[PDB]
Ligand binder design. Structure first.
Ligand SMILES: CCCCCC(=O)CC(=O)N[C@H]1CCOC1=O
Ligand SMILES: CCCCCC(=O)CC(=O)N[C@H]1CCOC1=O
Lengths: 225, 233
DNA sequence: GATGTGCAGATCTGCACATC
DNA sequence: GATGTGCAGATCTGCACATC
């Protein structure tokens, strides 16, 4: 199947509100074995988030102003380049406080991750993180920093631009719109043929159409894609 | 200082496209370039947003230079910022490429900086700053990572907010193709189209597959999508 | 209800050929 | 070239039923 960066690039192109996007982001994170994801926009010390991290951890994170303690945000602020982090692996040279921070985050299964930080308008920044409950992130192939940046640039803009087709309906329909067969969609998305078949036939039924070409035309005409 | 930063700031302003294109043109000028060019590529089907001379835009597509331009070739091959130069590449270039670059020079396009990225559904987009200088003499190399981050945002601003192409490759449908394709777009089968338009099933079959051949698409859904996207229906 | 499984028959797509 | 013929195999659509 395609990489999650490609999945994110595809998602950045679908229509819909924040709710639709979050459903899609969570599914991608889950699909690739991550416990959650988090998008953060940071201007100075002011942060806004689009994440599926436990609400309890989010509240604590905001309440105790962890943006100023989180080693991940520190690195992101320091260098705009994708990186992997690990609470366990980073232990040495981590203040007693940064240590307490990681132990608390561990209670939520946030122990390691991959983060992609980029510069955005007005000298501010945005970062996207894929979190794991594993001790460390082990990768056979290093992720292309350039491709990672291009992907997050699109994801950031899409979020900044914030009935509808759901993420799977939209994502699958978009591939139908570029000539893919359902088997090919199953392969690139890493899902079962039947999941693609079921999702799309339901879309067809809800819109009362008899062919993919009709669903495609109606979706485009109605700005659903 | 740093046009990449200016582009990032511009990618954030939401308003009508007329202001976006003006902003892009202004940045290109401010930093000493002859102009800019954004291309969204979907296998030979290309849409452009650029302030390159209107005549060059017309020639570029009428001659299908996308298939000749070494800049596009390199972009399709590797998604990484690069600088190009007609004069510097001379030795490497064939007779058609040299000529190609010659015509471009007539429009103030002799060298440039191009940033290509991958976009949704296996396609790509690229942003170029063109100069009239024989070569780009950069004092400091432009960070490929930062460049990608910027163009990812510019691509989303142009594409997601549905900007009007300033130029694109020629794609059309003759009267019959259009008539039959409109029916396909509302759920009809080839047979049903034959009955309603009072023609042979083979007439509909051949008219549409030839159109599919011309657009280079594998399915009717794809032909339908490109046709609607291009306003042919 | 949300999804998934199966498949018969409907349709289309890819290829080789033929005719206007 | 534009249009038309022929068809095996690819691919989809509609309906019935299964899972949990
Ligand atoms: C609003 C919720 C906080 C999101 C924080 C973020 O983006 C970066 C990050 O994953 N930091 C990790 C590392 C240890 O705990 C975390 O949460
Ligand atoms: C529609 C106008 C064509 C834009 C093509 C483009 O984006 C890349 C590019 O700069 N190619 C250059 C190099 C020689 O001529 C050009 O135009």
């Amino acid at each position: 199947m395609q990489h999650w960066l490609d999945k994110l690039t595809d998602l950045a192109a679908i229509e819909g509100d924040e709710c639709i996007l979050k459903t899609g982001l969570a599914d991608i994170a889950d699909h690739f074995g991550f416990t959650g994801y988090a998008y953060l926009h940071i201007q100075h010390r002011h942060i806004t988030a689009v994440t599926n991290y436990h609400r309890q951890w989010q509240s604590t994170y905001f309440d105790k102003k962890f943006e100023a303690l989180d080693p991940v945000v520190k690195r992101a602020r320091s260098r705009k380049h994708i990186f992997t982090w690990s609470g366990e692996h980073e232990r040495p040279t981590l203040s007693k406080d940064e240590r307490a921070f990681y132990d608390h985050a561990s209670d939520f299964g946030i122990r390691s991750g991959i983060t992609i930080p980029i510069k955005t308008a007005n000298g501010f920044m945005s970062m996207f993180t894929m979190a794991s409950d594993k001790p460390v992130i082990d990768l056979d192939r290093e992720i292309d920093a350039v491709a990672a940046a291009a992907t997050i640039g699109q994801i950031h803009a899409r979020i900044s631009f914030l009935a509808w087709l759901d993420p799977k309906e939209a994502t699958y329909l978009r591939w139908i719109a570029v000539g893919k067969t359902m088997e090919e969609i199953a392969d690139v998305e890493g899902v079962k043929y039947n999941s693609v078949r079921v999702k799309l036939r339901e879309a067809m039924k809800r819109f009362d159409v008899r062919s993919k070409a009709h669903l495609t035309a109606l979706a485009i005409r109605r700005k659903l894609i």
